[PDB]
């Protein structure tokens, strides 16, 4: 009702939509009971009661036990049995169950309600040997699971007796032995904990309820919620349920199954069964499970009912189901059902098959494949993760999903060489740097000791869809000795290593792969998602190849080409950029810009060709000037530059010192450059249009857009747009061709949103840069936030990394403000977002709600953004 | 839409409140005509017509001239004369006039409308010599001022004639000679430019109107508007006005006066007069000026009327007036009036006297002293900045206003040594550090190559009122060689140098200072200001002495005590801070904190004592951690730290590297420290309350407030407040005394304003940190904005430095948002501001308008803030 919800024959107080309050288990237990399936009657204590228990100093809140007892009165009346009553005993199980899968909860306990009086009656009704062996096992399990007594003490007593009676197997103990062994188990309670074994079933129950509530706060449970940043959950529910017995004979048993294969998706029952056994009997390890076919032979009637129950449950839930069942002398009892966990390949197969079956429509099917299911299918995967558990030597952050296998190297230069030679390289560094970008691209996998889900390594890796395990604090990298260590284990250069960027696992040796499981059912499924979504999904790509990759993965255009990232390919390009940054005179700047123009024009041609017929938004330079400079001592930087620039050493020292900035993220960057050196903008715009026309002449449909970075005033935008229009006029005149184009702005400075109504009058489109916008809104340095982020997460100051999940109340308020103002000022304004949040499912759902026109994300995140964009609609 | 506004006998179309449209001159001409003063009738062409002329490619827009002629018809009818008519000639002057004083506009031209026919009649009617000398003068002035013909060519003709006719002085020429000479002046037009002298008055007029409009865009006018950051002004007005003749004889003349002494403020007419001369002769400064007594003797009636008119004008304008007047044959004409420019000493004297006289009320009096006047009374100024223009060698950011003159040194230690020896030191560094604070205090001026107007070093400088020029990228400092360079120029140690911290100018040599003026009336005037203002003025002070200086200057309390700035005084304090920053264990931190506690407690006692009876707001640590480390090589820093820390060298290296940050302004600072290391907040809060109780026990009234820095979520504030309350309870229990106190938060992060309604529930007060808030809102690094600020100002992107003048449309919107949300959530919330804008007059007006409770500023700005709070001039 309020905290206690009963369920029984043909009725129930809860339902499947109350997982939050009753947990998954309690919710479906009620659901199965309400649809008329044979479910042993019971009650569920809500998750709110768990929270009240924790908030009340780990003690049951007033009144709760009376509500619990009312529920028990229902269960007793329904079973025509009573707790302490040896003539008509009621036995109970106590089962944990939160809203979602949660490790560290209390294991389920069975046969709660046994004592000497009840067992004596049980002995008379069903045999002494069976009764006292059950009593013995209950003493062991209840003590361990509820009281915290290790099994080793109960086993010590069992072996002691066996030793002193010369008996070699458990099976050789007489009922008299077991009756005395019961007394020994009882003693274990006093010896281990000093409490007695509770002989009143109601005390056993109170202890079990407390233990389940306590389990919610177990160190294992807290760590799971902390790591995965699970925030909603109030607590765990407690399910108290009447017992049914699958260990009464060869017409009895217990089993589990998925209604379809959870690996392949094949529509065929997939499960186990144990004849003459309780649920607990395999966990005890004493029995080996058999296939379902055994049930069909030994219980044809119960098997028949099970099959039809599976059809019922699939029809009712419209999904593949994970069910637990027990048969007590030909009578089938349903004990659990839930949506069945499955692989990505299984999810897509099941969803598509269920559509073909007419069981679900495409709207529902889109909700049957999780984004994480899709992600499995987009990358290489290990053939059998469980097979390599033995070889795992560390676990870091899953920076970029996918499997990688190769040989260890400690240098980006060596990674390129090895890749050129056809070797597979796993690049291992403490941290990665701009100079490492070449090798990182060449490496099969990247492993770093520092850095979070937003490190340089992590984001560049995730851009390329390249496996990356980041922030692996366990490793110590030693360049000088060409090794890295984990404890006393040494891993040398050349050694084979495997990385799982999805789980963060670091594995020794050359593990077996499977390629991405591209297949027809995925294309058909994604086509449903594509027809469903309202948002368009553009791509963040800076190179022709990345643009092509982006289109192959479904991108409908380029929402962001970061021109600052278009000079990593070769030394000549790096040399030219360095000349431009080191320039002091306007002639030195003209020389450097004239060198850069062919590279910009050529790359833009390649991007335009890849995106034939789709819009391409190119952004003006927003460079990290200090990052374009060599790494090393000021003696090496000045010397290397002197070679690349030809300038005197003192001129380089002067310029380096003049370029240094205390806070470069807020410094002389973005449109502040384009405005201060309009020649820079002229060069880039000339490359854009010269390339646009050239490709137009080759039959390529060019739909160019030019975007200004880091705008905080309408005047900045107006200034750069003026330059753009001038250069467009010239090029069009020179080449005898005029192309339509658009000019727009980043909205990544809080001020831009605050006066968006002024900026909207002057822009064809907005694109939210939520990386900088989050940085400026919070005042978090995107390069240093790791210094306090973990504490802030631990202390409940933040729920997620705001650089990963979009901050709705703060940043999101600027996004709504800018969008509203912009569209009011310019009804034809287009609004997108190209920050990292654009690929993050919950943020995509937010962006859809705010009415944006598109999201833009790096190429291998496009499929995810697509499915995410479809799931918020349906 | 009207562009021509006439004025004449007892009527006028404009008025004094239309300066924006008619200019000051045209407005007051109309105003004087309207109050019935004898003003020569005329018309004013609006500043809009100037803008239209500039927007129509420097040509008169279509209907304007016909509108000008209609105005001329009015003038002609009013004077009963006509242009070109020798029987009843109308002669005109053309006078420029913008809304405010503006150099670079066209000089006034007189006697427009003369030719041979008109002059022949003028001769007959009013004397040949007067006519032809007027003609000759007009030919010269019109040719030079309107046609661009140098005076030297006209003078060459005059001298030639004198040479041939054997006469020595101009005045010795007969009317016949002048008649011959005008023909020569006519020839000058042809010889000089190939132009003819326009004989038609309407053409003369057309050219004069064009020239005035063109003069608005003169290089000198552009530069003045640019350097003074004058934005708004559409153009200049043109005044076409009937002539009166002060050169008809010895019963005629021209004069200027102030209605009171502009230097002393004495209520006595202060001016000059020239018998038999035109206003041109007053500009030229060739004739020796005669005293007003000369006018009284020679034109008694005109003098009597002038004295009457001066009282009229003072009553009408309620201020001291600067008037120009002409006497034509005993008849007085008023030709200009405006509020008279005056010194700071004069402004105060005039304001107080006018109150005593019953002419104005205290309300108006507080408007009669500009903040710049008060600044002239309180601080040194250079006597005439334009005179040293030739010696300026660089211009940096005006970090702290004021004039400094001293000898160059490159070391804070030498600066204090020199100050002890009685020398004046200009401290020149690349950057300043904590260890330099002593020398900075001892130096007359500070010049840095890096840093902005709001870099904490500059902030500390402005605290002392010490002239500081920052961000002077032109200079290269060389400590070893004991010089610094600007281009090829070398400036040695010991050389004399002058700094203008208001303009950022760096001047070679010893420049002259304006003598500070003592004012006996300043106390009563400031008292009126104090009664008038609504805002309270608190002080930003971090030491007991600074607190006392703030109180002496009128501070009503401490709005911000920056605890990070409370460890500069000695080496022992710096070491203690270094022990705390280098701490890795909680024990090392507890040690360091125990060492810091006595300094904090001692300082807080001194501050509480100085501010006896007034509120003192102490802010928790917000430190630049990198800045607290020794200067020098990483070999020296590690050794110095190793000695006093007693940590291993490798532990120091690792900690130094772990503390380094890419963007420290957005890094591990503010409440991010207090939350990560609550022991730090415990220590500070314990010092605060222990000091508060101690001083209370000595009879001091302590009104303590504790403020949390850099909050962006309600959780951050809640966290630190929880710590504060815990410590408060302990200390009050320990010492047996309970004090009332308040807890609050900085609003200096855009997110804090965006969710202020949540933060307001948990704060007793907000204080806007508009330094950081501007930094985060614009994305401008407070230390590096100087690299593009000048370009942005020059290109019209910014109107002001947003770190100096509050950005109302952006940052101001967050201020209003936060204030509104906070007060809705907590009706008793107090809201202040302690950013640098708190001392800036226009920003103080804005803060008044948004309904803040107080402004807080550094001690020497308190007086300007007080007056600014009284004036509230947007
Ligand atoms: N009242 C009962 N009568 C008979 N058999 C029972 C009864 N309650 C339970 N069981 C069995 O006990 C075993 C464990 O129960 P759970 O429901 O806890 O499932 P678990 O795998 O332990 N964790 P989870 O599924 O993730 O929630 C199952 O096989 C069920 Br059929
Ligand atoms: N119609 C007239 N009859 C006679 N004399 C006249 C007439 N119009 C003007 N003058 C005089 O000409 C001189 C210059 O005129 P301005 O208005 O230009 O004053 P300036 O100082 O040069 N610029 P300012 O700073 O705005 O005041 C003044 O001395 C006036 Br009285
Ligand atoms: Mg189960
Ligand atoms: Mg950006
Ligand atoms: Mg004048
Ligand atoms: Mg601050």
Author numbering:
A (entry chain A), B (entry chain D): 1 to 874
Reported in the publication:
Here, we co-crystallized the C4-PPDK from Flaveria trinervia and the related C3-PPDK from Flaveria pringlei with their natural product PEP and the substrate analogue 2′-Bromo-2′-deoxy-adenosine-5′-[(β, γ)-imido]triphosphate (2′-Br-dAppNHp). Electron density maps clearly indicate main chain connectivity and most of the side chain orientations for subunits A, C and D, whereas the majority of the NBD in chain B is not traceable. The overall structures of both FtPPDK crystal forms are highly similar to PPDKs from C. symbiosum, T. brucei and Z. mays consisting of an N-terminal NBD (aa 1–340), a CD (aa 380–515) of β-strands with associated α-helices that contain the catalytic H456 in helix 20 involved in the phosphoryl group transfer between NBD and PBD, and a C-terminal TIM barrel containing the PBD (aa 535–874). Therefore, the structural conformations resolved in the 2'-Br-dAppNHp-FtPPDK structure visualize and verify for the first time the proposed phosphoryl group transfer mechanism in the PBD and the involvement of the catalytic histidine in the CD in this process.
Here, the rate limiting regeneration of the primary CO2 acceptor phosphoenolpyruvate (PEP) is catalyzed by the multi-domain protein pyruvate phosphate dikinase (PPDK). Previous studies emphasize that PPDK has a modular structure consisting of distinct substrate binding domains for PEP/pyruvate at the C-terminus (PBD) and for nucleotides ATP/AMP at the N-terminus (NBD, aa 1–340). A central domain (CD, aa 380–515) catalyzing the phosphoryl group transfer from ATP to pyruvate–or from PEP to AMP–via a phospho-histidine intermediate mediates a catalytic cross-talk between the distant substrate binding domains. Distinct conformational states resolved in crystal structures from maize and the non-plant organisms Clostridium symbiosum and Trypanosoma brucei suggest that the phosphoryl group transfer in the catalytic cycle is accompanied by a large swiveling motion of the CD from a position next to the NBD to a position facing the PBD (~110° and 45 Å).
